[PDB]
Design a protein around this ligand. Sequence first.
Ligand SMILES: *Cc1cc2c(nc3c(=O)[nH]c(=O)nc-3n2C[C@H](O)[C@H](O)[C@H](O)COP(=O)(O)OP(=O)(O)OC[C@H]2O[C@@H](n3cnc4c(N)ncnc43)[C@H](O)[C@@H]2O)c(*)c1C
Ligand SMILES: [Br-]
Ligand SMILES: [Br-]
Ligand SMILES: [Br-]
Ligand SMILES: [Br-]
Ligand SMILES: [Br-]
Ligand SMILES: [Br-]
Ligand SMILES: [Br-]
Ligand SMILES: [Br-]
Ligand SMILES: [Br-]
Ligand SMILES: [Br-]
Ligand SMILES: [Br-]
Ligand SMILES: [Br-]
Ligand SMILES: [Br-]
Ligand SMILES: [Br-]
Ligand SMILES: [Br-]
Ligand SMILES: [Br-]
Ligand SMILES: [Br-]
Ligand SMILES: [Br-]
Ligand SMILES: [Br-]
Ligand SMILES: [Br-]
Ligand SMILES: [Br-]
Ligand SMILES: [Br-]
Ligand SMILES: [Br-]
Ligand SMILES: [Br-]
Ligand SMILES: [Br-]
Ligand SMILES: [Br-]
Ligand SMILES: [Br-]
Ligand SMILES: [Br-]
Ligand SMILES: [Br-]
Ligand SMILES: [Br-]
Ligand SMILES: [Br-]
Ligand SMILES: [Br-]
Ligand SMILES: [Br-]
Ligand SMILES: [Br-]
Ligand SMILES: [Br-]
Ligand SMILES: [Br-]
Ligand SMILES: [Br-]
Ligand SMILES: [Br-]
Ligand SMILES: [Br-]
Ligand SMILES: [Br-]
Ligand SMILES: [Br-]
Ligand SMILES: [Br-]
Ligand SMILES: [Br-]
Ligand SMILES: [Br-]
Ligand SMILES: [Br-]
Ligand SMILES: [Br-]
Ligand SMILES: [Br-]
Ligand SMILES: [Br-]
Ligand SMILES: [Br-]
Ligand SMILES: [Br-]
Ligand SMILES: [Br-]
Ligand SMILES: [Br-]
Ligand SMILES: [Br-]
Ligand SMILES: [Br-]
Ligand SMILES: [Br-]
Ligand SMILES: [Br-]
Ligand SMILES: [Br-]
Ligand SMILES: [Br-]
Ligand SMILES: [Br-]
Ligand SMILES: [Br-]
Ligand SMILES: [Br-]
Ligand SMILES: [Br-]
Ligand SMILES: [Br-]
Ligand SMILES: [Br-]
Ligand SMILES: [Br-]
Ligand SMILES: [Br-]
Ligand SMILES: [Br-]
Ligand SMILES: [Br-]
Ligand code: NA
Ligand code: NA
Length: 490
Amino acid sequence: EDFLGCLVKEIPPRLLYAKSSPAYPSVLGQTIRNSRWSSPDNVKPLYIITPTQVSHIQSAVVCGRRHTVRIRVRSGGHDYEGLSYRSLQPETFAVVDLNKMRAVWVDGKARTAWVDSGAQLGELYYAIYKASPTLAFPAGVCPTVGVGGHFAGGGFGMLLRKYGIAAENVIDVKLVDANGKLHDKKSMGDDHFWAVRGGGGESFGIVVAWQVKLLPVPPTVTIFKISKTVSEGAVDIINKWQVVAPQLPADLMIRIIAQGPKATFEAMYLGTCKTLTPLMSSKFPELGMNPSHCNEMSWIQSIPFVHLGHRDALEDDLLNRQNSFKPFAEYKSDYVYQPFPKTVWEQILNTWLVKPGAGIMIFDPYGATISATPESATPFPHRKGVLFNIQYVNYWFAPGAAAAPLSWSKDIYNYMEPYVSKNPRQAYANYRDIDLGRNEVVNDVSTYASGKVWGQKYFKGNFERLAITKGKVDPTDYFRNEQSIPPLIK
Ligand SMILES: *Cc1cc2c(nc3c(=O)[nH]c(=O)nc-3n2C[C@H](O)[C@H](O)[C@H](O)COP(=O)(O)OP(=O)(O)OC[C@H]2O[C@@H](n3cnc4c(N)ncnc43)[C@H](O)[C@@H]2O)c(*)c1C
Ligand SMILES: [Br-]
Ligand SMILES: [Br-]
Ligand SMILES: [Br-]
Ligand SMILES: [Br-]
Ligand SMILES: [Br-]
Ligand SMILES: [Br-]
Ligand SMILES: [Br-]
Ligand SMILES: [Br-]
Ligand SMILES: [Br-]
Ligand SMILES: [Br-]
Ligand SMILES: [Br-]
Ligand SMILES: [Br-]
Ligand SMILES: [Br-]
Ligand SMILES: [Br-]
Ligand SMILES: [Br-]
Ligand SMILES: [Br-]
Ligand SMILES: [Br-]
Ligand SMILES: [Br-]
Ligand SMILES: [Br-]
Ligand SMILES: [Br-]
Ligand SMILES: [Br-]
Ligand SMILES: [Br-]
Ligand SMILES: [Br-]
Ligand SMILES: [Br-]
Ligand SMILES: [Br-]
Ligand SMILES: [Br-]
Ligand SMILES: [Br-]
Ligand SMILES: [Br-]
Ligand SMILES: [Br-]
Ligand SMILES: [Br-]
Ligand SMILES: [Br-]
Ligand SMILES: [Br-]
Ligand SMILES: [Br-]
Ligand SMILES: [Br-]
Ligand SMILES: [Br-]
Ligand SMILES: [Br-]
Ligand SMILES: [Br-]
Ligand SMILES: [Br-]
Ligand SMILES: [Br-]
Ligand SMILES: [Br-]
Ligand SMILES: [Br-]
Ligand SMILES: [Br-]
Ligand SMILES: [Br-]
Ligand SMILES: [Br-]
Ligand SMILES: [Br-]
Ligand SMILES: [Br-]
Ligand SMILES: [Br-]
Ligand SMILES: [Br-]
Ligand SMILES: [Br-]
Ligand SMILES: [Br-]
Ligand SMILES: [Br-]
Ligand SMILES: [Br-]
Ligand SMILES: [Br-]
Ligand SMILES: [Br-]
Ligand SMILES: [Br-]
Ligand SMILES: [Br-]
Ligand SMILES: [Br-]
Ligand SMILES: [Br-]
Ligand SMILES: [Br-]
Ligand SMILES: [Br-]
Ligand SMILES: [Br-]
Ligand SMILES: [Br-]
Ligand SMILES: [Br-]
Ligand SMILES: [Br-]
Ligand SMILES: [Br-]
Ligand SMILES: [Br-]
Ligand SMILES: [Br-]
Ligand SMILES: [Br-]
Ligand code: NA
Ligand code: NA
C-alpha cells in the first residue's frame, strides 16, 4: 500500500494498475512480443504505471526510491528476454510503460527532431517522411520496435553502412535518473551521455525523449532480393561476399538471409538501378545482378518493403499497434572478423539450416561508416575489422514445441565457436541473450564480476567505463535487471 499510496498522490489513478485491476492483463500484454514470456509461469509486475507526462515518471521513480520498489521501464516491449516486463526469478517490481508518450516533432529545415521513447520506429520514420521525402534516420528494420530500448541498445538497420548506428546520431536526450531528477546533455555530463547512447537499456535511467539529427537520402533508393540455392552455387558466391560486402561503397548494403540450402541477398542502394548495375558488375559480378532485379522506391517506402515484401501499405505497416505477431522466439548473435573457410558455409547451408527446429540466419555486413567510428567513441564496440554480424532467429508457434528449436540454437552456437570472434565472443546488446550470462546480486547490488561475463561480450573494451559511469549515476543499482550494467565504485 505504501508505494501504491505514494503513486496515487501524484499520478492520475487511471494511469495506475495493480494485478487486482480488471484492465491489468491487457495493459501487461499489449506490447509483449514473445509468447514465451506471456505464459502464466512468468513473473509479473506488482504494479503498472502508464505516464503521459514526464512529471508522472519523476513521481514514479521518487516513490519507487522512497518505498524501495524497483522499476523496469518499457517502451516498445521487444526485449528478446522480456526484461522490460518480467523478471527471471520471483521479485517485486513495477513496470513504467511509456506507450502513451509517443510524440515525434520534426524540424525539417534544422534537420533535427525530438522523439518520445514510447514512439515506435515506424512512427518516427513516418513523421520524418511527412516533413521531407529526402530525409531519413538510420535505425532498425522492425516498425513496432520502441525508440527507448532501440536507441539505448545502439540500433542498426539498412542504413548502418552509410550512417552507423541510431545511437551515434542522437544529439540530445531527456532523462530521468535514479533520483527522479530530469537531465539533458547540458546537465548530465559526459560519461552519462556517452553511456546512455548504446550502453543498453534500463541501466542508465529512463530516457523520456531523444533528439536526433536527420540525414539526407536520395529521392530514389534501389532494393533487390536475389536468391541463390546451393545448386546455383550459393556457397561460392557467399564465400566471396564475406570479403567484398564489407568494403563495398558506403551507399551499398547487401545483407543475407538464409533458412535452408539457399541464400537470399537483400540489398539497399542509395541511388538508382542505372548506377547500381555497373557497380555490381564491377565489384560483385559473381551475384549475377542485372536491371530486372532492381526495385526503385523512396526511402520511406523501402521500410515496409524490406521487412515485409509489401510496397503499397505505408500508414498501415509503419503505424500499427495491434501486435498479432506474438511468436515464441529465441535469438542469438555473433560477430565475424576474418572470413569463413568455404567448408563452414557448406555446413551452414546444407546441414545446419536443414535440421529439426532449425532457425533463420541473418548476415549484416559492416565496414564503411559503422566501422569508421572508433571502438570506444560509443559503448558499441563492434566496429573496425568487422566483416559481418550474424543473428540466429528461432520462431515457433505452439507452447509445447520448444525443445527442438531451443536445442538447435544451442547446438549451432556451439558449432560456430571456432569461426566467430573470441576472447570475448562478441554479441549485440539489442539481441539480448540471457544464456551469455546474467548478474549475481550481493547485498541488493549487481556484482561487477558477474556483470563482466556477458558485459564484455556486448560491450568489449567499453564495459568498465560503463560500470564506472553506472557507479556515478546509480550507485545503489536501482535501475537494474538480470543483465544490466553493475555499478563499479571504491
Ligand atoms: C522485436 C524485434 C526486435 C528487433 C527487430 N529488429 C531489429 C533491427 O533491425 N535492428 C536492431 O538493432 N534491433 C532490432 N531488434 C531488437 C531491438 O532493437 C531491441 O529488442 C530493443 O532493445 C527493443 O526496444 P523496445 O521495443 O523499446 O524494447 P523494451 O522491451 O521496451 O526495452 C528493451 C530494454 O531497454 C530498456 N528500456 C526500454 N525503454 C527504455 C527507456 N525509455 N529508457 C531506458 N531504457 C529503456 C528496457 O528496460 C529493456 O531492458 C525486430 C523485431 C520484430
Ligand atoms: Br511517499
Ligand atoms: Br483520473
Ligand atoms: Br482498470
Ligand atoms: Br495477468
Ligand atoms: Br496503456
Ligand atoms: Br499476452
Ligand atoms: Br520477440
Ligand atoms: Br507473479
Ligand atoms: Br511532459
Ligand atoms: Br515527487
Ligand atoms: Br522502504
Ligand atoms: Br530499491
Ligand atoms: Br531462470
Ligand atoms: Br528464461
Ligand atoms: Br536471476
Ligand atoms: Br535552421
Ligand atoms: Br528539434
Ligand atoms: Br500533413
Ligand atoms: Br529494429
Ligand atoms: Br512488422
Ligand atoms: Br552530440
Ligand atoms: Br521533458
Ligand atoms: Br527536475
Ligand atoms: Br531538461
Ligand atoms: Br552541452
Ligand atoms: Br545545466
Ligand atoms: Br557521469
Ligand atoms: Br538492450
Ligand atoms: Br545537428
Ligand atoms: Br543524398
Ligand atoms: Br535520385
Ligand atoms: Br524484390
Ligand atoms: Br532471385
Ligand atoms: Br555446396
Ligand atoms: Br562464384
Ligand atoms: Br577479409
Ligand atoms: Br570492392
Ligand atoms: Br558512397
Ligand atoms: Br539500369
Ligand atoms: Br554494366
Ligand atoms: Br563472375
Ligand atoms: Br524499378
Ligand atoms: Br515510391
Ligand atoms: Br522511385
Ligand atoms: Br503509400
Ligand atoms: Br493500429
Ligand atoms: Br573472427
Ligand atoms: Br581481426
Ligand atoms: Br538432425
Ligand atoms: Br579506428
Ligand atoms: Br570518448
Ligand atoms: Br582490424
Ligand atoms: Br573496416
Ligand atoms: Br511450431
Ligand atoms: Br519440440
Ligand atoms: Br515455450
Ligand atoms: Br530436441
Ligand atoms: Br574455438
Ligand atoms: Br575474454
Ligand atoms: Br567469451
Ligand atoms: Br550460449
Ligand atoms: Br542472485
Ligand atoms: Br540486502
Ligand atoms: Br541480495
Ligand atoms: Br572483477
Ligand atoms: Br574485452
Ligand atoms: Br573494444
Ligand atoms: Br572492460
Ligand atoms: Na577477439
Ligand atoms: Na534467449
